[PDB]
Design a protein around this ligand. Structure first.
Ligand SMILES: Nc1nc2c(ncn2[C@@H]2O[C@H](COP(=O)(O)OP(=O)(O)OP(=O)(O)O)[C@@H](O)[C@H]2O)c(=O)[nH]1
Ligand SMILES: Nc1nc2c(ncn2[C@@H]2O[C@H](COP(=O)(O)OP(=O)(O)O)[C@@H](O)[C@H]2O)c(=O)[nH]1
Ligand SMILES: [Mg+2]
Lengths: 427, 430, 88
């Protein structure tokens, strides 16, 4: 009776979410036609969490596809598992945001928010009790960053007691994709610190070295990156969809991992990742999962977790396993290196067990880390933002759409306030 | 729907578009008769059944080049009234293309813009083609861009202009026509891409290793960049970039909107088998100073912001792996306040090679359009070319008698000197 | 019940799953790399059998490469420990 409405914004959210529904619907056994052909009875126990039952045995994803260009909608629809969504939920613009935060939040976003809020309320009122909202987007863009954060602000006004997951990628330090990345990112985090209930932080270049160094994959593309993103998405809501020895809904993770209302920026990773040349040499057992779980290079965020102490951690274990040996790995990881954990929170790591593993994997686990080293990621975007805003470069496309320079001085202050409050808890 | 209208002005505009529309019919399989034996909507409008017509206008005051297209191999491709001829040319005079004879034909020019913009559902940009060294390209172009600015607000215009080379130039009054042309194209054109003849001569001399080529080989090689810049509206890719994304990721300031252009794999047919092309290898070749399309050495200035637009089988880490080595290289130097300086765009078709063209089939391609502070040199040289000739008032009585007053040269001189101060000011380290 | 009209196919020129930009080595397997995407073997040491099978005769190059492999095998041999059998 707990359900999640998925919202996908921009080219990043549509591409990630198309792979996300390829993973979840395969995990519940939904073929691309839309009906059910799995061989397990337990998949139909909790199917209303991500699906709406329709006529003829057809299951439609509870997904809302929103952007400002028609290009990504045709890419999602023409791809495999693209015929399962409602054509009514394909809300899209025509002009295009053009990678601009001002265009997506003020001038070409506003005439589409009333269109997408109409189908937000249609999906929510159709289902029983909203567990929360899950949104996947980017922060360097303008189609999903500016417009998506406008949708979060409207949903937070309409539904203030419901949870909110945001899965966002950030501008990378090593390389870059657009030139106006720090302008869009600093404005987006300014709109995410008050509105998002908990934000999982992703980085496309912490995904690449996972794909290259760990997976030993010679040619990783965006399709390979989104599948590693989508694997973690199924891990967060594993206890909702399937029974477990110690269940943990989305709110149980929130109360454990959020010590203070502004420190909800997390980092995530997926534990059983091996190359195909290292499948047979791997002895899959829970101690082997925890060494990869707590490894810094398995984190999907570019911030190194050894540089800051862990405020709170959590693991979403899946599969048949013994609870005390899960527990004694958690007691060990807080005792072998206790300098990496916060002194004034005893028993930092929260554990949960789901009795049903993912398809083709005997044991899996999903980590959520609220490490204070996340301030290194926000300070380098702020380092890029203070450089560009000082010469007022690329600002006339932002100030021509009705957003004067006062918001930029406000957005930089909250970004600098976000890194100062993480820094003092490292002390 | 995404779609863009092209405008071809002047003798160079007709011949560039002659090679440009030769390519576009090939990449979508459109035969020269106009019948195809989804993606064509950005340049071809579906008329009736089995007929496509280009989204262009061919306007030129000299009737000798429009009727060549009318009697050429693309007689059936173009709408007959879509190509606009004229009675007499401007004949290397800015005043004739702006005051005397330009005002008569410009009414017919905007009228076809009505029918092309009303037929198109969502217009996304304008592609204006001209050479400022001539009368029709500069004079009628400034008049046309004046009326398009008042009638279409906030619509992007892409301007592919051909400035004179410091050494290799054809007409004597090209500095006079170029300086007056700047008074319009700064405050009207949103995105301008500068091209130069001798830089393309140098690209043809070494990279294609063809000894004695002509304008037909330039226009075929210019159209590769024109196709690659708008390849995202045509064909799908990992990182689609629209015409409004170059319009915002490349210009830091409203009056700095001139950019270079380059094309990485420029390899002849005989050299293709010996040469190995890699994403790291062509990206290093794309940033070579000899491969620029305008003769300004980029080492003298700093790159403002670059937009690498890729084609073919390029995986998204290899544009990222290539740009990692590019940023570490010391010869390439950015301005200090622009840490992220790259725009990446990856489409999936390899570039369609034309039959009879010297360019070979390449699996990968890069089109790098970059703003840089070295563009002040191509403006300062024409600045030096013009005051030296205007000092004792030569070739002025031709301009004075054709409606233009003497003071417009003084206003255009002051406006161009303001651009010289702007490129120097934006490149200052603080 | 009402008029059935199919919407026109208007869209960007899509590409198949065979392209390098959209190939997914983890497709329907939940974050495990698929078969037929094996790891690159180190140095890609081709055996002499694949060269002899494409040449018509055992040429001098094949004979020299077989001599090199024979020297490698003679270096590997130990004269005290048989392969899978004990001392002597
Ligand atoms: N790159 C390139 N440039 C050309 C080509 N054809 C003409 N040009 C340019 O055109 C300039 C000569 O003046 P034009 O622009 O042709 O004169 P116009 O546009 O016909 O103006 P009017 O003669 O008054 O009608 C030269 O400096 C060339 O740079 C061409 O095929 N390729
Ligand atoms: N994981 C993932 N990230 C992507 C993909 N496509 C783009 N991105 C990221 O999105 C950022 C650029 O955002 P953009 O494409 O402009 O988003 P938009 O403005 O919402 O359309 C880059 O930093 C990329 O790393 C994808 O298919 N998968
Ligand atoms: Mg002429």
């Amino acid at each position: 009776m707990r359900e999640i409405v998925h919202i996908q914004g921009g080219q990043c959210g549509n591409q990630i979410g198309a792979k996300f529904w390829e993973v979840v619907s395969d995990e519940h056994g939904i073929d691309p036609t839309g009906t059910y052909h799995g061989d397990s009875d337990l998949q139909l126990e909790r199917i209303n969490v991500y699906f709406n039952e329709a006529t003829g045995g057809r299951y439609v994803p509870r997904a809302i596809l929103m952007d400002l260009e028609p290009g990504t909608m045709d890419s999602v629809r023409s791809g495999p598992y693209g015929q399962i969504f409602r054509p009514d939920n394909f809300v899209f613009g025509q002009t295009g945001a053009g990678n601009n935060w001002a265009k997506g939040h003020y001038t070409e976003g506003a005439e589409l928010i009333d269109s997408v809020l109409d189908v937000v309320r249609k999906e929510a009122e159709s289902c029983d009790c909203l567990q929360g909202f899950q949104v996947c987007h980017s922060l360097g863009g303008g189609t999903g960053s500016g417009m998506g954060t406008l949708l979060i602000s409207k949903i937070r006004e309409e539904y203030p007691d419901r949870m909110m997951l945001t899965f966002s990628v950030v501008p990378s330090p090593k390389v870059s994709d657009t030139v106006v990345e720090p302008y869009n990112a600093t404005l987006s985090v300014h709109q995410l610190v008050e509105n998002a209930d908990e934000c999982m932080v992703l980085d496309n270049e912490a995904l690449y070295d996972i794909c290259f160094r760990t997976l030993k994959l010679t040619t990783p593309t965006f399709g390979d990156l989104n599948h590693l993103i989508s694997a973690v998405m199924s891990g967060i809501t594993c206890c909702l969809r399937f029974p477990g020895q110690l269940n943990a809904d989305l709110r149980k993770l929130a109360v454990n991992l959020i010590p203070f209302p502004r420190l909800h920026f997390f980092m995530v990773g997926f534990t059983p990742l091996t190359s195909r040349g290292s499948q047979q040499y791997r002895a899959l057992t829970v101690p082997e999962l925890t060494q990869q779980m707590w490894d810094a290079k398995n984190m999907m965020c570019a911030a190194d977790p050894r540089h800051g102490r862990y405020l709170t951690a959590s693991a979403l274990f899946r599969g048949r396993m013994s609870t005390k040996e899960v527990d004694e790995q958690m007691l060990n990881v807080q005792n072998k290196n206790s300098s990496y954990f916060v002194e004034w929170i005893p028993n930092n790591v929260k554990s949960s067990v789901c009795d049903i593993p993912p398809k083709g994997l005997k044991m899996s686990a999903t980590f959520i880390g609220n490490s204070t080293a996340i301030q290194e990621m926000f300070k380098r975007v702020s380092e890029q933002f203070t450089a560009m805003f000082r010469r007022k470069a690329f600002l006339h496309w932002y100030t021509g759409e009705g957003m004067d320079e006062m918001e930029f001085t406000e957005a930089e202050s909250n970004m600098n306030d976000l890194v100062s409050e993480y820094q003092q808890y490292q002390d | 729907m995404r779609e863009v209208i092209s405008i071809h002005i002047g003798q160079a505009g007709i011949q560039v578009g002659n090679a440009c529309w030769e390519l576009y019919c090939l990449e979508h399989g459109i035969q020269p008769d106009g019948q195809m034996p989804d993606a064509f909507n950005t340049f071809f409008s579906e008329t009736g059944a089995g007929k496509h017509v280009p989204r262009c206008i061919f306007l030129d005051l000299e009737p000798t080049v429009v009727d060549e297209v009318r009697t050429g191999t693309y007689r059936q491709l173009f709408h007959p009234e879509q190509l606009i001829s004229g009675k007499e040319d401007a004949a290397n005079n800015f005043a004739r293309g702006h005051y005397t004879i330009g005002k008569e034909i410009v009414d017919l020019a905007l009228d076809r813009i009505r029918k092309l913009a009303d037929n198109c559902t969502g217009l996304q940009g304008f592609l204006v083609f001209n050479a400022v060294g001539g009368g029709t390209g500069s004079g009628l172009g400034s008049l046309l861009l004046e009326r398009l600015s008042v009638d279409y607000g906030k619509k992007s215009k892409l301007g592919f202009t051909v400035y004179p080379s410091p050494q290799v130039s054809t007409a004597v009054v090209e500095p006079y026509n170029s300086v007056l042309s700047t008074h319009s194209l700064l405050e009207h054109t949103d995105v301008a891409v500068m091209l130069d003849n001798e830089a393309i001569y140098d690209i043809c001399r070494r990279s294609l290793d063809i000894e004695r080529p002509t304008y037909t080989n330039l226009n075929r090689l210019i159209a590769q960049v024109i196709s690659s810049l708008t390849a995202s509206l045509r064909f799908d890719g990992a990182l689609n970039v629209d015409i409004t994304e170059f319009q915002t990721n490349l210009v830091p300031y409203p009056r700095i909107h001139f950019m270079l252009s380059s094309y990485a794999p420029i390899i002849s047919a005989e050299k293709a088998y010996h040469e190995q092309l890699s994403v790291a290898e062509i990206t290093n070749a794309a940033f070579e100073p000899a491969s620029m399309m305008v003769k300004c050495d980029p080492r003298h200035g700093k790159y403002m912001a670059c937009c690498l637009m890729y084609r073919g089988d390029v995986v998204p880490k290899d544009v990222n792996a290539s740009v990692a080595t590019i940023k570490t290289k010391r010869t390439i130097q950015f301005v200090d306040w622009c840490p992220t300086g790259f725009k990446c765009g990856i489409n999936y078709q390899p570039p369609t090679v034309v039959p009879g063209g010297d360019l070979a089939k390449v699996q990968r391609a890069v089109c790098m359009i970059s703003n840089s502070t070295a563009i002040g040199e191509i403006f300062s040289r024409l600045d030096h070319k013009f005051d030296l000739m205007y000092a004792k008032r030569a070739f002025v009585h031709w301009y004075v008698g054709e409606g233009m007053e003497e003071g417009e040269f003084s206003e255009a001189r002051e406006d161009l000197a303001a651009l010289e101060k702007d490129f120097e000011e934006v490149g200052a380290e603080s | 019940m009402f008029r059935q009209e199919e919407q026109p196919k208007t869209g960007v020129r899509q590409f198949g799953t065979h392209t390098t930009g959209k190939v997914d080595h983890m497709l329907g397997t939940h974050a495990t790399v698929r078969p037929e995407y094996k790891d690159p073997p180190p140095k890609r040491t081709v055996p002499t059998s694949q060269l002899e099978a494409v040449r018509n005769i055992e040429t001098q190059y094949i004979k020299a490469r077989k001599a090199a492999e024979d020297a490698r095998e003679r270096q590997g041999t130990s004269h005290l420990y048989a392969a899978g059998k004990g001392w002597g």
